[model samples]
Target: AINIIEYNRSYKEELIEFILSIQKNEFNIKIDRDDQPDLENIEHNYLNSGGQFWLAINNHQNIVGTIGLIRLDNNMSALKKMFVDKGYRNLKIGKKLLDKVIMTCKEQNIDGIYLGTIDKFISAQYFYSNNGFREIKRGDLPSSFPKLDNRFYYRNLK
Candidate 1:
């Protein structure tokens, strides 16, 4: 079984490793930690902004699937760093992680959620679309939104 819990400083190292490993091993993108500066300040970049970082801990206390949410404004937030361990894929961990985000949004009164993903990440794109996120033009994004020039998705909360 896996336990879903909010972020804690103790899990920082494991979290970063998990995120990086998934990106490299699963997606074949060996990104530098410096480029992903947010991992260095999860407490400040996420939790401090009325957002959250949720982690999935297995029975042996390994961090598996993880999802990050950071507030961009009173009514909107940006989703980032969502990944599940390679061995755990297709086992509903991603769905559970996303559900936490949705449930958090409703509880926290956020109205809109947006996320940006690379074109190569087909699974993420399909998952987002199936979960009510719709594609939006870059010009349609808010100034505070953090993402690349192209891909963008937003969904209004139920």
Candidate 2:
């Protein structure tokens, strides 16, 4: 009943609920539903923007976690919204999602891939570095990178 699957319009509602819940209750990272329209329109803002989003669904077909890869309009492909539900942690859901992104970038000759998060997220910082993402100043991020969140990171795929 539970499995990993790629993005599709039919799963739109699940994607939003999955991300909003994790960002709110788990990460405590307050997201402005209005400021961040991408969360609501994953198909257009993410999937249609030359990006990818994946979800882990349970026996009830309820999404329990999510990961996203967005090919930014500027210069880099970004790793975004890599969060797993509390109930699903320690199940390699995060690792599988991260590995999926790495493999995806590897499949293409990308110049660089990056992600943005907060410094309060110590474990997330460690996870990124463990997976080869090197820390850099926020100013170092591309011009198109979102400025709302600081603590940017990057690594090459080529």
Candidate 3:
């Protein structure tokens, strides 16, 4: 069985390895550990700021999926580090992980959520669109938004 659970310290090492492998080996994104300081300190970058990081762990105790909600401002947040293992694709794990974030946003009274992705990640782009996130121009992003890939998306909870 797969369980969606809150991030914990014990899973830290596995989570980082899982994410980096997908980004670098699978996607060839050219990113490295140094570029993502948050992975090294999840508590400070996420949990402490009224945000959260979630992981999908199976009965075998392997991390199959991951997602994070990063509070950017009082009513806005950015979706970060969403990824699922290749074997877990098409299993709705991505939707479930995203649902966790959206549910948290509604509970926390966040009005909108933002994210970025590259063209090569076409499936992810479609997933965001199908989930009610609309493509938006870079100029439309909030000042606090951490600029990333070329394509930007925003989901309005209002």
Candidate 4:
């Protein structure tokens, strides 16, 4: 009984909880951070800055996952903050969120989509690669790159 929805004012709290839950699990991969970003800040910034976000929810109206698309350089957008709750893993929720992000990019006429992920997130790497993302040469890390060991991947939209 899963459902997908566009970002809206009411979905903020559930989205925040979902992200924090994922961040907690991220300890297994050795990321160290004292404070998590404020969810209202993220949502406000995205909406005011012309970015987009989406969420996945179950029948009970609990957000199980979330992802965002932020404008990068020259009509390009970076896929950001993708996460699915631990309990919801292996249900193709990740792929569904990714597909929605890709379609949003297409609608926006974005030239390409890129993402930065840590080496320890092996399953995420496999997910992106299997879904048509390819590794891009690494240089300066983007501001959105988490403060951990990471690599970049990209896909041309057209």
Highest lDDT: give the candidate number. Answer: 3
Candidate 3 residues 9-117, lDDT tens each?
8888898899999989988998998898899989888998899899988898789999998898658999999998899888899999988888888999999999988
Clash count of each predicted structure:
0, 0, 0, 0
lDDT of each: 0.85, 0.76, 0.90, 0.75
Worst ten in a row by lDDT for model 3 = 114-123
lDDT of 4 by residue, 1-158 (tens): 67888778777666766666566666464432335453567667665676778888899877888888778757777778788877788899999998888887788788778788877677778888998889976664355433333678888888
Which one wins on TM-score?
A: 3
lDDT of 2 by residue, 36-147 (tens): 6787778887777778788877888778778888886544788888877777777877788777777776675456788888876777788888887998887788877766
lDDT of 2 at 10: 84
- Report the Cα lDDT for candidate 1: 0.85
Write down the TM-score of every candidate. 0.93, 0.86, 0.96, 0.83
- Cα lDDT tens digits, model 1, 31-136, are 7678788899889988997898999889988898899998886588888888888688778898899889999999998898888888767788888898889999
List the pairs of residues colliding in candidate 4: none
Window of ten residues with lowest summed lDDT in model 2: 102-111
